[PDB]
Structures are given as C-alpha cells and as structure tokens.
Write an enzyme that holds these catalytic residues in place. Structure first.
Site, short mmCIF file in Angstrom:
data_model
loop_
_atom_site.label_atom_id
_atom_site.label_comp_id
_atom_site.label_asym_id
_atom_site.label_seq_id
_atom_site.Cartn_x
_atom_site.Cartn_y
_atom_site.Cartn_z
N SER A 1 46.39 -82.36 47.17
CA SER A 1 46.18 -83.46 46.24
C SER A 1 45.10 -84.39 46.78
O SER A 1 44.95 -84.56 47.98
CB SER A 1 47.50 -84.22 46.05
OG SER A 1 47.34 -85.40 45.28
N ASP B 1 62.33 -70.46 41.47
CA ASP B 1 61.97 -71.21 42.67
C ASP B 1 60.61 -70.78 43.19
O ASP B 1 60.50 -69.76 43.87
CB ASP B 1 63.03 -70.97 43.74
CG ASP B 1 62.76 -71.71 45.03
OD1 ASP B 1 61.89 -72.60 45.02
OD2 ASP B 1 63.43 -71.40 46.04
#
EC number: 3.4.23.22
Length: 330
Positions: A199, A35
């Site tokens: 992004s 994770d």
C-alpha cells in the site's frame, strides 16, 4: 468457464464469511470460509473426532461415488490466530457457483482445535493463497483456483465482501457492474505464498494522506485490519477514550463513539473504509467498551489487509503468469 457464488457473513459483526461449496457425487454442500491467506481446502467430515463436531455439516467420503483416498497423504495446519486442524486426504469433485474441478484434494479433518468446534457455522476452509503453502504431505496439492485456472475464461477470481450483508466470489471474470470508477492494479510478491502487496499510505478521517509504503497481505480469512503500531496509534488517537488494552488484547473504544474513516492507498488510488466498518461491538455482552477493527500487527510479523479493509473494495486476485492485485471502490 466461470463460477459465481454468494458469500454470507456468519454473524452480525462480519466475523467471517461462508460460501456454499458442492463436494462429491451426489453433491454434499458445505459452507466454507474462503481464505486468501492459506492454501488448504479442508472440511469437517465423518472422520472428525466426534467430540470436536458441534453443529457443523460434515463431508462423508464413503457416500461419494467420486471420492478416492489419496493414499498416504496427511495434512496439518496452524493459523495465525492459534487455531489448527489435521487429517487425511481424498480427491473428489468440487464445485463453486457452477465452476467444477475434478480431482480436487479435499482434506478431511480427523482433529480440529476448539475454535473450529465452537463455530457451528463454518464447515471448513477453502484456501486461495498460492499452492506453495499447501500442507499436504508427502505430495503437496493444488488449490481449487490453481486447478480451475486453465479452464477459466480469465485466470482471476474476485472478492466482493459485504458490510453486514452478503457479497460475491466470482471465478474467471470481472463483473464490471460490481464496482465504481476504475480498478487500480498493483504488484504482488508470491515469495511468502501470499497475495502480498505494498500500500502507498493512509489517512485517518478527513486528515491528510500520509505517503508511506506498507507491505501486507490481502487476506479474506482474517477478520480485522492489522497495520504497523505507528499507523494504528494515529487512527485511535482520533477517538476520544480509545486505548490499547493488554487484558482485552488490543484497542478498545467507548461504544458511544463515532469512529472516523480510514483510507488506504493503492498506487495513486484510495480506498475509504467507513468508520462503522471498524466497530466490532462490545468486548463482552452488555459492555460499553467496544473492540476496534484496526489493530497492531506488531508481533504478527506481517501486516494483514483483512475483511475490514477488503469489504470496502472490489478486489481482483489476478493469477496470470505474473500475479497482481486490483482494487476498486464500490
């Protein structure tokens, strides 16, 4: 040194991925959920409340000759999905894919929430976010990666998750055969303890690319792709009959649909998520309403590039002095 381990979806939907991990001496192999959005290595154990164990493999520290109680240490964690666990702490030898760390903090669960109990395939979590998020008190502990880093050939790990198929976590090296083209690297902020990046925009299907900054985290421990409501609405508007359902808890779509792809930007590069990666199947057995793999982050407080996005790429988690993230197509 290096390590390389195969990671395998837990079910037919790729709801999560498990990776075998050797703990203790002799080795006890547990299947952990790696994770990159948390920083605790915790396991089901011989200390876990018996009624809260249902099929998981447990770590028994008393059977490990290298286990040592970390005196006075406790841990307690709550995840974004509302699940939680807590317990005490041992140090022991932990190996992943041939890479060994001695003295790793292994957090032994005394209590786990129902979601963990109900998932027989996940024996615990191995956190790969920054150690500043580790919950051990009163002395915070380091992640497996943080402990291994100085010994690695290069201070990196990579995630290569499969779509409905196994994939690979590598430590200490970049497998140049595992991706196509080049890896595009992008800046990381560690201010919130995550692999947080921005992004450069998105496209829906064959549509034009929208240049827009989307700050979010690369999180292997989250199943879906959580993005701003504007972006998510633009995606689902291209699927006839798709709608946000408050009763179900997100966007659903007719199972008869063909889903469009979704592209996200990494600098000037583009990662394309095929439409089929966005199908999470019937909302309940036999239903013709299917659950979407792109959902709104509104009210999460952060955008999450979870498995839906990451499995479309070869992803480099670069733990150099100034960390960065790399993405390649594959």
């Amino acid at each position: 040194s290096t390590g390389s381990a195969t990671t395998t979806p837990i079910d037919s939907l790729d709801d999560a991925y498990i990776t075998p991990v050797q703990i203790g001496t002799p080795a006890q192999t547990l299947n952990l959920d790696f994770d990159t959005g948390s920083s605790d290595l915790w396991v089901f154990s011989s200390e876990t409340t018996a009624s809260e164990v249902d099929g998981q493999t447990i770590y028994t520290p008393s059977k490990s000759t290298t286990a040592k109680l970390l005196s006075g240490a406790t841990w307690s964690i709550s995840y974004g999905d509302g699940s939680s666990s807590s317990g005490d702490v041992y140090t022991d030898t932990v190996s992943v894919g041939g890479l060994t760390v001695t003295g790793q903090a292994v957090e032994s669960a005394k209590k786990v929430s129902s979601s963990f109990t109900e998932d027989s395939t996940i024996d615990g979590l191995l956190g790969l976010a920054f150690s500043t998020l580790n919950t051990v008190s009163p002395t915070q502990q380091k992640t497996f990666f943080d402990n291994a880093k100085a010994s690695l050939d290069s201070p990196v790990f990579t995630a290569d998750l499969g779509y409905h198929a196994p994939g690979t976590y590598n430590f200490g090296f970049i497998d140049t055969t595992a991706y196509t083209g080049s890896i595009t690297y992008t800046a990381v902020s560690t201010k919130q303890g995550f692999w947080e990046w921005t992004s450069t925009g998105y496209a829906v299907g064959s549509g034009t690319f929208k240049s827009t900054s989307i700050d979010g985290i690369a999180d292997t421990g989250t199943t879906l792709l959580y993005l701003p409501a504007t972006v998510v609405s633009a995606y689902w508007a291209q699927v006839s009959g798709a709608k946000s359902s408050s009763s179900v808890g997100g966007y659903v779509f007719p199972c008869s649909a063909t889903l469009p792809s979704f592209t996200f930007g990494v600098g000037s590069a583009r990662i394309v998520i095929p439409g089929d990666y966005i199908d999470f199947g019937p909302i309940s057995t036999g239903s013709s309403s299917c659950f979407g793999g792109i959902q709104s982050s509104a009210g999460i407080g952060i955008n999450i590039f979870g498995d839906v996005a990451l499995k479309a790429a070869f992803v480099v988690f670069n733990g150099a002095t100034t960390p960065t993230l790399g993405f390649a197509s594959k």
